[PDB]
Design a protein around this ligand. Structure first.
Ligand code: CA
Ligand code: K
Length: 90
C-alpha cells in the first residue's frame, strides 16, 4: 500500500490502491457522495486509524472494521458509508 499518515486513510476507486486516492482522517463520518457511491474498492489505512464501514447509507447491510490496508473491499457489496475513528479495540 502507498504511504499514509497515521491518522489518515486513503480510498481508491480501483483495487490494489491504484489511481487517484481520496484522503479522509480520524474524526470524520462520511456518507459517500452520490457520484462516488459504491465506487471505492481499496483503502490504505494509517497506523492509528480504523475504518468502520457499511454497505448502506443508514448504517445497515454488510459491515466491516478495517484496521489495516485493504487491497479489495468488493465483499462489502458497495461501500456507501464509513467512519474513521481512533484505532482502539475498546
Ligand atoms: Ca452501497
Ligand atoms: K490502523
Amino acid at each position: 500500500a502507498p504511504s499514509v499518515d497515521p491518522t489518515k486513510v486513503i480510498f481508491y476507486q480501483k483495487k490494489n490502491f491504484e489511481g487517484s486516492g481520496d484522503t479522509y482522517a480520524v474524526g470524520q463520518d462520511v456518507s459517500v457522495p452520490g457520484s462516488l457511491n459504491d465506487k471505492y474498492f481499496s483503502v490504505a489505512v494509517g497506523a492509528s486509524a480504523k475504518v468502520i464501514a457499511w454497505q448502506h447509507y443508514n448504517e445497515t447491510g454488510h459491515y466491516r472494521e478495517w484496521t489495516t490496508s485493504q487491497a479489495d473491499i468488493s465483499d462489502i457489496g458497495g461501500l456507501s458509508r464509513f467512519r474513521v475513528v481512533d484505532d482502539d479495540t475498546r
